[PDB]
Amino acid sequence: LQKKLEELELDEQQRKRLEAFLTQKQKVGELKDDDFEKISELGAGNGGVVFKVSHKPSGLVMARKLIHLEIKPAIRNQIIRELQVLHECNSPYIVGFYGAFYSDGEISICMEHMDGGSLDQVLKKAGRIPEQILGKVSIAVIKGLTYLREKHKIMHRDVKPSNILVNSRGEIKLCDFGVSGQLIDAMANAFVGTRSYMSPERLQGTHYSVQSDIWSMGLSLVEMAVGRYPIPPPDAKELELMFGCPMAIFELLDYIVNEPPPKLPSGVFSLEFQDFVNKCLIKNPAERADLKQLMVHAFIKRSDAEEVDFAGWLCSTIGLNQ
Amino acid sequence: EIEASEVMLSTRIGSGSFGTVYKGKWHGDVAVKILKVDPTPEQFQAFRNEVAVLRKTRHVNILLFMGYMTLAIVTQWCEGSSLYKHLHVQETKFQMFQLIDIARQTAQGMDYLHAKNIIHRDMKSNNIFLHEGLTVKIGDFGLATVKSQVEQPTGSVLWMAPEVIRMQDNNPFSFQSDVYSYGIVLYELMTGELPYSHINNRDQIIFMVGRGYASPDLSKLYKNCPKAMKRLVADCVKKVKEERPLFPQILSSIELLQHS
Numbered sequence: 001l002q003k004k005l006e007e008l009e010l011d012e013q014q015r016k017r018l019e020a021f022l023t024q025k026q027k028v029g030e031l032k033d034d035d036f037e038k039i040s041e042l043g044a045g046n047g048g049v050v051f052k053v054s055h056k057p058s059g060l061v062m063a064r065k066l067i068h069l070e071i072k073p074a075i076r077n078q079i080i081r082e083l084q085v086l087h088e089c090n091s092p093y094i095v096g097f098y099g100a101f102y103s104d105g106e107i108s109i110c111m112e113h114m115d116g117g118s119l120d121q122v123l124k125k126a127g128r129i130p131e132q133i134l135g136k137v138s139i140a141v142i143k144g145l146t147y148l149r150e151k152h153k154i155m156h157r158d159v160k161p162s163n164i165l166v167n168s169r170g171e172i173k174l175c176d177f178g179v180s181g182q183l184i185d186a187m188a189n190a191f192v193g194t195r196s197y198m199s200p201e202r203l204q205g206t207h208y209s210v211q212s213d214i215w216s217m218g219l220s221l222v223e224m225a226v227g228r229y230p231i232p233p234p235d236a237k238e239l240e241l242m243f244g245c246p247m248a249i250f251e252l253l254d255y256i257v258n259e260p261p262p263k264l265p266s267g268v269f270s271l272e273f274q275d276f277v278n279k280c281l282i283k284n285p286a287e288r289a290d291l292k293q294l295m296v297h298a299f300i301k302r303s304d305a306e307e308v309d310f311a312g313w314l315c316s317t318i319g320l321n322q
Numbered sequence: 323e324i325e326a327s328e329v330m331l332s333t334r335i336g337s338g339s340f341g342t343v344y345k346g347k348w349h350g351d352v353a354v355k356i357l358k359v360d361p362t363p364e365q366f367q368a369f370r371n372e373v374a375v376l377r378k379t380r381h382v383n384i385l386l387f388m389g390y391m392t393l394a395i396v397t398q399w400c401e402g403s404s405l406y407k408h409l410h411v412q413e414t415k416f417q418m419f420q421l422i423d424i425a426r427q428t429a430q431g432m433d434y435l436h437a438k439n440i441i442h443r444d445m446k447s448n449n450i451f452l453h454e455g456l457t458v459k460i461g462d463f464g465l466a467t468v469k470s471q472v473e474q475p476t477g478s479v480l481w482m483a484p485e486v487i488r489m490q491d492n493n494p495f496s497f498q499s500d501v502y503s504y505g506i507v508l509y510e511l512m513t514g515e516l517p518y519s520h521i522n523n524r525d526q527i528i529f530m531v532g533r534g535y536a537s538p539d540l541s542k543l544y545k546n547c548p549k550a551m552k553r554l555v556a557d558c559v560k561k562v563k564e565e566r567p568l569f570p571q572i573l574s575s576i577e578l579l580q581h582s
């Protein structure tokens with residue numbers, strides 16, 4: 001694991017933080033249900049719920065997600081085994097992992113606690129997220145998707161604001177990606193949602209790849225930039241009513257597949273940012289930009305060179321002390 | 323309305339699509355579902371009118387509905403396992419005639435509910451229980467006021483009728499939409515699996531089933547499943563809802579093949 005860190009191109013602080021997290025993982029052995037003390041709820045969703053817990057043996061603060069599934073015991077054990085790959089998913093742009101176990105009919109996934117929550121929660125407080133902040137967010141998502149592709153040969157499958165986590169150290173990390181094929185299958189038996197970030201090619205059941213995650217990132221970037229889920233697109237009057245001078249689920253899916261993708265409004269955002277999300281939301285995945293092209297896009301090259309105090313902005317927005 | 327003082331909430335069982343089930347005591351073993359709904363006053367009256375209908379239901383294949391509390395609903399507690407657990411978790415050893423009998427009793431309870439002008443809205447193996455062995459009990463029927471008003475789909479995708487997915491008209495619920503959901507339960511019984519085992523994307527299922535691009539793979543039905551039962555599964559899950567049979571005809575077809 002510490003050798004796999006040298007294969008990553010990190011700055012010195014990113015290497016120190018990963019080495020520190022790997023050290024804390026040594027203080028974690030088997031994970032049992034009776035070893036955790038709840039502190040607070042962090043949020044809930046369709047699949048399950050998340051708690052902030054204290055692992056009494058190690059003393060480490062963790063985020064414990066509980067997914068309720070009615071599955072065969074063999075499928076459950078295979079899910080626990082497939083989740084062990086997360087022990088080797090160590091990157092500045094990937095949420096850390098502590099362990100997974102089963103109890104009370106619930107598969108528990110204990111992971112690194114991100115005291116900034118998800119960008120979904122940050123957006124509800126900020127209203128909109130500035131373009132320069134979204135530049136750092138885009139770089140983190142592209143690099144996280146690149147890490148999963150090169151180091152683990154998997155795609156994310158569920159990129160959206162709620163699965164992009166932040167913390168008081170300014171870090172931006174991906175989570176809830178499809179590391180367990182059995183867990184993806186089991187969660188397909190789900191309740192109907194109210195919105196979607198799924199690419200048009202995955203909705204139609206044709207061939208897909210990380211290009212689908214690029215679409216989801218583009219749709220996520222528009223939502224955080226305008227402060228509203230962008231399907232259907234807003235009116236020109238709604239734009240001035242948001243920057244200054246409801247469809248049901250099937251209708252949204254039909255819109256994603258059969259209607260032009262949303263776009264950022266002109267004027268309030270730079271032309272580089274507008275072109276960036278346009279290349280992310282090209283409906284044909286073969287015409288859509290890929291991870292290599294996005295990293296050398298003019299918007300990313302400018303954002304990468306900018307000095308942005310993201311941790312300070314989080315502190316001033318959600319009240320998260322550094 | 324039931325007095326909360328007489329309700330002794332014991333253990334927590336789990337949560338579903340519109341509430342959280344607790345075991346309790348109220349003049350006997352009772353099930354209490356803490357509904358996920360601060361309700362609007364217009365909705366509270368629509369709820370009280372539904373409860374008056376559901377409380378009068380009386381059938382051997384239907385779970386008893388007691389009343390409401392203050393929001394929560396009190397139903398008959400069932401100590402058996404759900405059909406979903408028997409088929410997909412425990413993998414209970416069922417004979418073919420036992421699977422047909424489960425299909426028959428489920429059609430009897432549905433025929434009773436529809437003859438009483440009650441749409442289930444959420445028919446699935448999770449809401450079917452096996453009581454004292456092989457006695458079907460249907461639960462979580464009706465409750466449109468607390469499951470949802472907003473004309474948006476609510477419930478499990480796999481059993482949802484295509485016209486209910488689309489929600490093109492404000493009310494896509496009918497006796498035929500329950501028959502589609504019942505047909506998916508038949509698919510569970512006669513395959514031991516869930517539909518669309520090759521699709522691991524919830525949003526893909528919603529879209530393809532809504533457009534008619536995806537339908538249950540009927541080649542996976544058991545080889546010893548009778549041809550009349552195979553046709554019944556195909557008739558219940560017809561994409562066009564006007565082509566689906568109703569439960570009087572469904573029950574007669576099962577009774578015909580059962581008596582050979």
Ligand SMILES: CNS(=O)(=O)Nc1nccc(Cc2c(C)c3ccc(Oc4ncccc4F)cc3oc2=O)c1F
Nearest residue numbers: 095097111157158175176177178179180184187523524
């Ligand atoms: C909407 N798109 S979809 O239809 O493809 N559905 C699905 N998408 C994507 C994934 C899955 C399943 C899944 C889930 C949800 C999952 C959640 C948490 C987890 O823990 C950590 N994660 C990252 C970093 C550290 C961790 F500790 C591992 C997980 O692993 C998984 O495999 C899906 F079902």
Ligand SMILES: Nc1ncnc2c1ncn2[C@@H]1O[C@H](COP(=O)(O)OP(=O)(O)NP(=O)(O)O)[C@@H](O)[C@H]1O
Nearest residue numbers: 042043044045046047048050063112113114118162
């Ligand atoms: N590691 C973590 N650290 C801190 N907060 C977390 C962590 N993981 C999840 N959360 C929070 O817990 C919430 C619940 O997440 P989750 O159960 O995945 O539902 P969701 O992703 O938000 N929506 P959905 O994917 O549709 O179920 C998230 O929205 C986050 O705010």
Ligand SMILES: Nc1ncnc2c1ncn2[C@@H]1O[C@H](COP(=O)(O)OP(=O)(O)NP(=O)(O)O)[C@@H](O)[C@H]1O
Nearest residue numbers: 335336337338339340341343353398399400448462
């Ligand atoms: N009347 C009942 N008696 C005993 N157990 C029950 C009863 N109703 C529900 N349960 C159990 O309580 C848990 C949650 O129930 P429920 O909220 O109905 O979830 P669900 O049926 O799977 N989804 P849904 O019914 O559509 O909301 C499951 O383990 C059920 O088996």
Ligand SMILES: [Mg+2]
Nearest residue numbers: 045162163176
């Ligand atoms: Mg999530």
Ligand SMILES: [Mg+2]
Nearest residue numbers: 338448449462
């Ligand atoms: Mg139920």
Ligand code: NI
Nearest residue numbers: 576577580581
């Ligand atoms: Ni008979």
